């Protein structure tokens, strides 16, 4: 499937498209 982006949401925004801020961490929606 879609793996965990594993990015931190910087300024409310994520770096990888198709990721959502869950706890400040980018995970796939």
Between CA 27 and CA 17, with CA 3 as vertex, the angle to 5 degrees is 55
What is the layout of strands, in order, in the sheet containing 7-8? 7-8, 25-28, 19-22
DSSP states of 1-29: -PPP--EE-BTTB-SSTTEEEETTEEEE-
Please tell me the distance from the alpha carbon of residue 28 to that of residue 10, in angstroms, as a whole number.
Answer: 16
Experimental method: NMR
Contact 9, 23 (CB under 8 A): no
Burial-class residue 18 by CB neighbours within 10 Å (0-12, 13-18, 19+): exposed
Please tell me the distance from the alpha carbon of residue 15 to that of residue 17, in angstroms, as a whole number.
Answer: 6
Please tell me the distance from the alpha carbon of residue 26 to that of residue 14, in angstroms, as a whole number.
Answer: 6
């Amino acid at each position: 499937g879609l793996p965990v982006c594993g990015e931190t949401c910087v300024g409310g925004t994520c770096n990888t498209p198709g990721c959502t801020c869950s706890x400040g961490v980018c995970t796939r929606n």
